[PDB]
Ligand SMILES: *CCC(=O)NCCCNc1nc(N2CCCC2)nc2cc(OC)c(OC)cc12
């Protein structure tokens with residue numbers, strides 16, 4: 330073990346809250362376009378990056394969705410989930426410098442999502458679903 | 473006022489439970505592209521069409537989102553809402569004969585959303601936000617409002 334689990338949790342909390350993202354970079358994938366590449370090896374289970382965005386409840390998510398007035402054909406950055414009796418939305422619509430929202434989707438990726446609680450506040454993170462080689466495209470799937 | 477409210481509530485319920493979607497058609501909208509055009513007049517407040525899809529709970533919404541495994545850049549047909557303190561999703565991903573999911577979005581729209589109850593079951597419907605003349609493209613706004 331619990332000590333090591335608590336200590337790894339602390340390192341994940343510190344990375345999440347620091348504002349820093351390492352071990353990855355934006356690159357153009359041949360025949361695909363923009364994507365995120367691992368610039369270091371990842372082991373199955375390792376923290377990759379947060380899917381960073383504003384955490385809001387469903388009422389505020391509806392207010393935001395109504396006001397963006399963006400066309401739905403271009404995709405949505407608002408992700409919904411339930412956590413301890415509440416429904417939340419991680420709204421990553423804002424065009425920030427964060428890499429989590431840039432990781433492409435795949436029918437079989439090397440990143441999976443997990444909810445990571447920080448003092449009763451859930452964070453949507455990407456963890457490695459298998460071992461990842463440096464240079465591989467980071468690809469998520471829901472799962 | 474209660475009589476007119478009840479008569480209309482029954483009119484909306486019958487249309488939903490019959491599958492028939494009258495006064496509109498699929499068309500190449502002038503100067504834009506594919507959409508839905510009104511083929512009759514609609515007064516402000518009138519029922520236009522339901523945003524038809526599978527009504528599911530959040531657990532099943534997560535499983536479907538995981539199974540479709542679609543590229544998120546092409547848009548999403550899964551609409552999340554709260555009704556009587558419970559979370560729902562109307563999933564219109566399936567390509568059916570239904571027109572509601574084909575109505576284009578616009579903040580300058582002529583259709584607004586409303587949650588319409590049928591024996592405790594919420595249905596997401598589109599209602600005319602203003603008068604709509606025949607030949608106008610139907611366009612939705614997410615607002616109530
Ligand atoms: C990030 C916000 C977002 O994209 N939300 C998507 C909500 C579900 N998708 C969707 N919803 C509707 N509605 C909901 C309320 C009545 C009309 N119409 C849609 C229409 C289209 O295309 C015409 C799409 O395309 C993906 C999605 C719709």
Ligand SMILES: *CCC(=O)NCCCNc1nc(N2CCCC2)nc2cc(OC)c(OC)cc12
Pocket residue numbers: 380403404405406407408409429430431432433434442453455469537544545547548549550
């Ligand atoms: C109809 C299903 C759907 O489109 N769901 C949208 C979910 C929110 N959008 C979104 N989410 C993520 N996540 C969620 C869990 C970690 C990764 N990544 C996204 C990435 C991209 O592009 C790279 C988009 O593009 C619109 C949306 C994402």
